[PDB]
Amino acid sequence: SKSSQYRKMKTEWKSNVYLARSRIQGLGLYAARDIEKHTMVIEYIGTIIRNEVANRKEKLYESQNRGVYMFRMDNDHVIDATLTGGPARYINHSCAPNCVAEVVTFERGHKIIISSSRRIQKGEELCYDYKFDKIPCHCGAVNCRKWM
Ligand SMILES: Nc1ncnc2c1ncn2[C@@H]1O[C@H](CSCC[C@H](N)C(=O)O)[C@@H](O)[C@H]1O
Ligand SMILES: [Zn+2]
């Protein structure tokens, strides 16, 4: 049951991850322990805001040469982790991910859950495919698409 998986992950995620210097860019999130395939690791949390508001914010931050932490969604909304976020905001992109950022809709709502797509060893850096629609990718993978 997704909702039981979710409830369990919500009380465990702190022991699933840690924050350290990335092998990809800046800071990154790492598996604190071994994690089985198809397992909820952590949630992307923040404040859901309309695209219009998000764009204004991004534009304001770029003026000071700062990035934002935002997970773009299909409903013209965004989860804004720039001010109130969690560790999942630090998970980097990979052309060869060990994770997926999946939509999970259930009793408690419409959530973005990061889950393992393979067995993941302690100390591996976590990453998922950001899925793009233009700056160079540093995921290091063999089949890197070179750009983001
Ligand atoms: N595979 C990749 N190659 C190059 N830059 C990446 C990347 N994955 C993530 N990033 C960078 O990280 C941002 C997502 S925020 C993720 C955490 C970030 N590494 C940090 O230290 O704050 C992107 O805007 C991009 O600047
Ligand atoms: Zn890449």
Question: Locate tokens 């702190």: which residue?
Answer: 14
User: What φ, ψ does residue 58 adopt, rounded to 5°?
Assistant: -60, -45
Find where tokens 């052309």 sit: 95
Bridge partner list, 127: 92
Q: How far apart are CA 80 and CA 127, in angstroms?
A: 19
Determination technique for this PDB entry? Answer: X-ray
Q: Resolution for this model in angstroms, one decimal place?
A: 2.8
The whole-angstrom separation of Cα 147 and Cα 135 is: 5
- Match 């990453």 to its residue by tokens: 127
Q: Which ligand is nearest to the CA of 138?
A: 1
In angstroms, what is the span from residue 75 Cα to ligand 2's centroid? 26
Q: Which domains, ranges and CATH numbers included, belong to the chain?
A: 1-148 (2.170.270.10)
For residue 33, CA distances in Å to 23, 38, 46, 84, 115 come to 18, 15, 25, 26, 14
Binding residues for Zn(2+): 95, 137, 139, 144
How many residues does the structure list for the chain? Answer: 148
Distance in angstroms (rounded) separating the CA atoms of residues 120 and 139 = 17
